From Swiss-Prot:
CDD domains: EFh. SUPFAM superfamilies: EF-hand. Keywords: Acetylation, Calcium, Metal-binding, Methylation, Repeat. Belongs to the calmodulin family. Pfam families: EF-hand_7. The modification N6,N6,N6-trimethyllysine is found at residue 113. GO terms for molecular function: calcium ion binding; enzyme regulator activity. The modification N6,N6-dimethyllysine is found at residue 11. The gene is CAM. It comes from Paramecium tetraurelia. Ca(2+) 4 binds at residues 127, 129, 131, 133, 138. Disulfide bonds: none annotated. This is Calmodulin. One of its GO terms (cellular component) is cytoplasm.
Length: 145
């Protein structure tokens, strides 16, 4: 599951939030960290964040709860990573929109020599805002479906 070095790294991350070293992260402590990073959530917002991680409902996050998170977040991060990178490759000019011309060039590079009407159908299927291009959200929604 985890090496001793992985555990030590995630103990150091936990310690950032567990200000007082009691083995738990409270809403106040999460707020202190958030504030240090430029965001000033309310108590209600902090409670929602704790509730999302607090598997036993005792009101605080312990080390085991924080390991189970962080392994959920990191996997989400690695998926994300990928869809991203792909996307930036299809988006040949980097403007945040995959055009029909871009999609055609990268499909040819993937071995598929497509017509304009084939690529336009691919975009129409995925296009939500109707601009005839694919943005990242459209791209993700179509990949994960
Ligand atoms: Ca604490
Ligand atoms: Ca707020
Ligand atoms: Ca708990
Ligand atoms: Ca583009
Ligand atoms: Ca679009």
């Amino acid at each position: 599951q985890l090496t001793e070095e992985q555990i030590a790294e995630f103990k150091e991350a936990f310690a950032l939030f567990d200000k007082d070293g009691d083995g738990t992260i409270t809403t106040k402590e999460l707020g202190t960290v958030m504030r240090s990073l430029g965001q000033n959530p309310t108590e209600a917002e902090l409670q929602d964040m704790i509730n999302e991680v607090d598997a036993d409902g005792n009101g605080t996050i312990d080390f085991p709860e924080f390991l189970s998170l962080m392994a959920r977040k990191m996997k989400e991060q690695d998926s994300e990573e990928e869809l991203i990178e792909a996307f930036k490759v299809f988006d040949r000019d980097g403007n945040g929109l995959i055009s029909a011309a871009e999609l055609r060039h990268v499909m040819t590079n993937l071995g598929e020599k497509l017509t304009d009407d084939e690529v336009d159908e691919m975009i129409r299927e995925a296009d939500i805002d109707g601009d005839g291009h694919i943005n990242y959200e459209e791209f993700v929604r179509m990949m994960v479906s």
